[PDB]
Design a binder for this molecule. Structure first.
Ligand SMILES: O=C(Nc1ccc(Oc2ccnc3[nH]ccc23)c(F)c1)c1cccn(-c2ccc(F)cc2)c1=O
Length: 293
């Protein structure tokens, strides 16, 4: 039904729409398979003189109407998400006899977590610190628009052919369903999300980077993370992590949310650490983290 939903709100879906003949969505070519997400290879015909390859995520036709909204609603968020360290949507061409569309630019290298784990790759201490700096830049931008991510993690970050990191979100709320291992104390306790709780999340992300994609707190259950922290615990210093960068992770996990540094100060602090390295140090994988989920 198009008569309709929110005939004054869902009008923004006008701009984000493609022309008559300018798209081809192959299903023999599958970008993957999420869960309730349409992840397939996709071909787009941009005006002309341009050949754009993208990731296609447009949902079924007569799926319903109340479950359809929640979708076209989240695709709109990216309307004004224009930063080089943030993912954005190419458009939404709603078919007449097919379905309404969605489009995300194609990322050659996929998800940041899987890239660092591949053994055929050889990142250095500088490479990894540089991936972290790039995430801090995107968060400083989202923070300024008063936008709260809620799920900052290395698996939600993307990587293209130039090695530019793009923050994104791969489309219950009590105990198990949420990302309890990336959450701040106040968040786990009261279930309310803020930018200062995005800072906590960023420090876990910096941990994943220096261990080359290891899982955080592998011995502790999600049901009891609050109890484990409240004893006075934090993740350990990785082998290939610089002293000063560990001091920064500790600051992101400060007990009082208002004492944590801002994304602005993080960008500042991390660029200095970065600037003192050349690239003569290789990071190898921990045997004990190897083959662990
Ligand atoms: O539908 C989203 N995202 C998404 C992310 C990755 C996806 O998979 C690929 C895309 C391109 N190349 C690939 N190669 C292999 C896999 C792959 C993919 F299909 C979709 C999305 C929706 C709404 C809001 N936001 C959003 C953005 C910034 C933000 F900061 C928070 C939320 C999103 O990200």
């Amino acid at each position: 039904d198009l008569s309709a939903l929110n005939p004054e709100l869902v009008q923004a879906v006008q701009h984000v729409v493609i022309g008559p003949s300018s798209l081809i969505v192959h299903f023999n070519e599958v970008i993957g398979r999420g869960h309730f997400g349409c992840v397939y290879h996709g071909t787009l015909l941009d005006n002309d003189g341009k050949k754009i390859h993208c990731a296609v995520k447009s949902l079924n036709r007569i799926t319903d109407i109340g479950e359809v909204s929640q979708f076209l609603t989240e695709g709109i968020i990216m309307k004004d998400f224009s930063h080089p360290n943030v993912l954005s949507l190419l458009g939404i061409c709603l078919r007449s006899e097919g379905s309404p569309l969605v489009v995300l630019p194609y990322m050659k290298h996929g998800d940041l977590r899987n890239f660092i784990r591949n053994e055929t790759h050889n990142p250095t201490v500088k490479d990894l610190i540089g991936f972290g700096l790039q995430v801090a830049k995107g968060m400083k931008f989202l923070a300024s628009k008063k936008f709260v991510h809620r799920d900052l993690a290395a698996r939600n970050c993307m990587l293209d052919e130039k090695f530019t990191v793009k923050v994104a979100d791969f489309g219950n709320k009590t105990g198990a369903k949420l990302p309890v291992k990336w959450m701040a104390l106040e968040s786990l306790q009261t279930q309310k999300f803020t930018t200062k709780s995005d800072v906590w999340s960023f420090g876990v992300l910096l941990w994943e980077l220096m261990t080359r994609g290891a899982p955080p707190y592998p011995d502790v259950n999600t049901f009891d993370i609050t109890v484990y922290l409240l004893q006075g615990r934090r993740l350990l210093q990785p082998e290939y992590c610089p002293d000063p960068l560990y001091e920064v992770m500790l600051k992101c996990w400060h007990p009082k949310a208002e004492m944590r540094p801002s994304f602005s100060e993080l960008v500042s602090r991390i660029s200095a650490i970065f600037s003192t390295f050349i690239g003569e140090h290789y990071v190898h994988v921990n045997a004990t983290y190897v083959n662990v989920k």
